[PDB]
Amino acid sequence: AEKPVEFVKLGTGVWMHTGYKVVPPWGNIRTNGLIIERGDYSVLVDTAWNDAQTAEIVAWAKDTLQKPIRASIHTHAHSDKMGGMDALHMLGVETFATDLTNRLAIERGLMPAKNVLNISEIGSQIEWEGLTILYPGGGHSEDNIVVNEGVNNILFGGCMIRPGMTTSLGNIDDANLGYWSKAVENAANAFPDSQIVIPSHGKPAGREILKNTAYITRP
Amino acid sequence: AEKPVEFVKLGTGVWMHTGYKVVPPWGNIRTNGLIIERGDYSVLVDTAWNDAQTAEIVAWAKDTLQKPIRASIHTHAHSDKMGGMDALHMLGVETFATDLTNRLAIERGLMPAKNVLNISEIGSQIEWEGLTILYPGGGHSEDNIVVNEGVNNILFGGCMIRPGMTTSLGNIDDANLGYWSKAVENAANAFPDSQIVIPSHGKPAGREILKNTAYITRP
Amino acid sequence: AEKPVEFVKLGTGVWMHTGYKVVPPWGNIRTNGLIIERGDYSVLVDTAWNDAQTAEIVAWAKDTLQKPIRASIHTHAHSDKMGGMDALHMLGVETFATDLTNRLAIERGLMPAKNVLNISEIGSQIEWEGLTILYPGGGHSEDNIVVNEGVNNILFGGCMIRPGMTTSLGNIDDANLGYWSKAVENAANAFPDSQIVIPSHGKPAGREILKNTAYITRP
Ligand SMILES: C[C@H](CS)C(=O)N1CCC[C@H]1C(=O)O
Numbered sequence: 001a002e003k004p005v006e007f008v009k010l011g012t013g014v015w016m017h018t019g020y021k022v023v024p025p026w027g028n029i030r031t032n033g034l035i036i037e038r039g040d041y042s043v044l045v046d047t048a049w050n051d052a053q054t055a056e057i058v059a060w061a062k063d064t065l066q067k068p069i070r071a072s073i074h075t076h077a078h079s080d081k082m083g084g085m086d087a088l089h090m091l092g093v094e095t096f097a098t099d100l101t102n103r104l105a106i107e108r109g110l111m112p113a114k115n116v117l118n119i120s121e122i123g124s125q126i127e128w129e130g131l132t133i134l135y136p137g138g139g140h141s142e143d144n145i146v147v148n149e150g151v152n153n154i155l156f157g158g159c160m161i162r163p164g165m166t167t168s169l170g171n172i173d174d175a176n177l178g179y180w181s182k183a184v185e186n187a188a189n190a191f192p193d194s195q196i197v198i199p200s201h202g203k204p205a206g207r208e209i210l211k212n213t214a215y216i217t218r219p
Numbered sequence: 220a221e222k223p224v225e226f227v228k229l230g231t232g233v234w235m236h237t238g239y240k241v242v243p244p245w246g247n248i249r250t251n252g253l254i255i256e257r258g259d260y261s262v263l264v265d266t267a268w269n270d271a272q273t274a275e276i277v278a279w280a281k282d283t284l285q286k287p288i289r290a291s292i293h294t295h296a297h298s299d300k301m302g303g304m305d306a307l308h309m310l311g312v313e314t315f316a317t318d319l320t321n322r323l324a325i326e327r328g329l330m331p332a333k334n335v336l337n338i339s340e341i342g343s344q345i346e347w348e349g350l351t352i353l354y355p356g357g358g359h360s361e362d363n364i365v366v367n368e369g370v371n372n373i374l375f376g377g378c379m380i381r382p383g384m385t386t387s388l389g390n391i392d393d394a395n396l397g398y399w400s401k402a403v404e405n406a407a408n409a410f411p412d413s414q415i416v417i418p419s420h421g422k423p424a425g426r427e428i429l430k431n432t433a434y435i436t437r438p
Numbered sequence: 439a440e441k442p443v444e445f446v447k448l449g450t451g452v453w454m455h456t457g458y459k460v461v462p463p464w465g466n467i468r469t470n471g472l473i474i475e476r477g478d479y480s481v482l483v484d485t486a487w488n489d490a491q492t493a494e495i496v497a498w499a500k501d502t503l504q505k506p507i508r509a510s511i512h513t514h515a516h517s518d519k520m521g522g523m524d525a526l527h528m529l530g531v532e533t534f535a536t537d538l539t540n541r542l543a544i545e546r547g548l549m550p551a552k553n554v555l556n557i558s559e560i561g562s563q564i565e566w567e568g569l570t571i572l573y574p575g576g577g578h579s580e581d582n583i584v585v586n587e588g589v590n591n592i593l594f595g596g597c598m599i600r601p602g603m604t605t606s607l608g609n610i611d612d613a614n615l616g617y618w619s620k621a622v623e624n625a626a627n628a629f630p631d632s633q634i635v636i637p638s639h640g641k642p643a644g645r646e647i648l649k650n651t652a653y654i655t656r657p
Pocket residue numbers: 023029078079080159169170171201
């Protein structure tokens with residue numbers, strides 16, 4: 001049985017959303033994203049697994065925060081991050097991703113974002129709705145980006161950061177195994193003040209999961 | 220003189236919209252689409268002939284149903300189904316069509332939908348806002364799709380289904396004359412429980428207009 | 439120091455917005471666009487220089503006119519006219535430009551409009567939200583369009599019309615120097631009743647700045 005959606009506060013105006021999917025043979029697996037408050041609206045980092053979970057997140061921001069989701073960013077073209085795009089579009093959310101993420105999404109039967117983030121070179125950063133978005137180079141995926149929230153100093157690593165003290169790498173079918181550890185180092189060096197690090201597939205932690213991920217994926 | 224727009228109830232939460240256009244030499248000709256209620260919003264099947272008629276439909280859902288139109292689907296790339304796209308986009312409606320419909324629309328000076336429905340193979344179906352959307356193969360047009368509403372068992376055949384007991388085929392300049400009768404059979408077999416069948420260019424009827432259309436367009 | 443945004447009434451339901459940018463070595467330079475009231479909403483001609491200025495314009499229409507901006511048109515692919523596209527998209531404004539303007543925008547790192555205006559041949563006109571949009575041919579830029587408001591007879595010339603009695607042409611790096619004066623003549627002949635003419639980079643004036651622009655850019 002699929003576990004229900006969860007919301008947890010990470011800092012002032014910053015919330016984690018978590019949805020679950022049963023993936024045989026191992027069963028329920030979480031994916032995490034963020035809701036970030038922006039005055040009288042909010043912005044979203046990643047969908048959950050599907051439209052229904054994602055619609056529940058939009059409703060929660062509207063009805064609990066009283067700060068409806070205006071716009072969203074997507075941290076790579078897999079179904080845990082873009083599985084609920086149709087729900088975002090029907091609910092009036094303005095969606096953003098890199099051109100490479102959009103192209104990969106279309107190829108895979110995912111829906112692309114409506115707007116392009118112009119960050120394609122390794123190390124490129126842009127400011128978006130008070131967040132710093134960084135392309136650290138290919139790692140978990142060639143298109144993975146990370147998102148830093150500088151008020152609370154929360155770094156969203158998404159699926160590029162592995163959970164806990166695992167030594168498993170997750171699904172690596174389209175990973176950049178050669179560059180992933182450098183990409184982690186690039187993110188860690190870009191955002192040195194962030195002591196809260198969020199992976200997609202585990203619990204919120206500290207910078208030890210940057211160090212551990214870089215070690216377990218290093219050549 | 221162009222006859223005005225009309226709304227008629229077909230079943231619980233399902234409404235037909237009808238707009239008219241004077242087309243010489245024969246004069247006024249109707250086109251039909253649907254409004255389908257979805258909780259506290261509604262969804263739209265097809266525009267009417269133009270922006271003004273389509274804006275009237277959007278206003279009617281907002282002000283009479285108190286269920287504003289959130290999203291729409293378009294059943295092929297002709298001006299009776301996509302003539303009012305600009306009005307939908309300006310009124311905040313999130314529009315959906317197949318990739319082939321969008322490509323044909325652009326070619327013809329029509330505006331494409333914002334989102335792609337991923338149904339391109341003959342017989343492919345998807346669920347969309349509680350509706351079943353089917354691509355039955357080429358018939359009236361290569362891109363024609365049909366839409367089934369399973370609560371009331373209403374099958375929207377659009378222009379692929381001819382009205383009444385006519386033997387005329389309408390404009391066949393880009394019809395698939397070889398496959399059209401099979402496409403009708405495919406729709407009839409896919410939705411056997413639907414005893415209400417809606418053509419674009421005639422009155423609501425029963426399954427006899429599926430049988431008649433398949434006969435008059437058969438090789 | 440960058441001067442703040444300004445709003446001035448030009449006629450019934452027609453407002454000019456003006457934003458400033460410090461461009462060394464000459465300093466602050468204005469750019470002008472329009473807000474045009476449309477019943478219980480408004481439409482926008484051009485962004486200002488950036489997202490922040492453009493968001494201020496959207497808020498002004500919402501809170502002062504009580505006629506929120508529903509849609510916008512963009513008169514060529516430079517940053518004074520499309521520098522605030524991301525703000526328009528996040529604020530729910532439905533954006534329009536020609537296909538050529540969108541293609542040039544993407545090339546230049548600007549964000550394209552969501553919808554295409556189908557005017558690509560010299561002299562083509564379309565009606566859009568009660569306005570007449572004309573492509574007069576290449577002048578300041580190959581893609582420049584002009585916008586006429588026929589109730590007050592206000593012609594928005596954008597950057598194709600130079601300010602005042604200047605003899606400077608502005609930045610001409612991608613101008614059509616051969617056709618620009620004819621393009622001005624084309625606009626003047628298309629909208630003979632407009633005695634208010636708005637350039638992007640100077641004060642509102644009369645038809646003397648059409649005549650002066652045509653003279654100073656003539657072969
Ligand atoms: C569909 C996701 C995209 S990152 C995936 O590949 N999974 C599912 C959860 C983690 C990882 C895995 O295979 O271990």
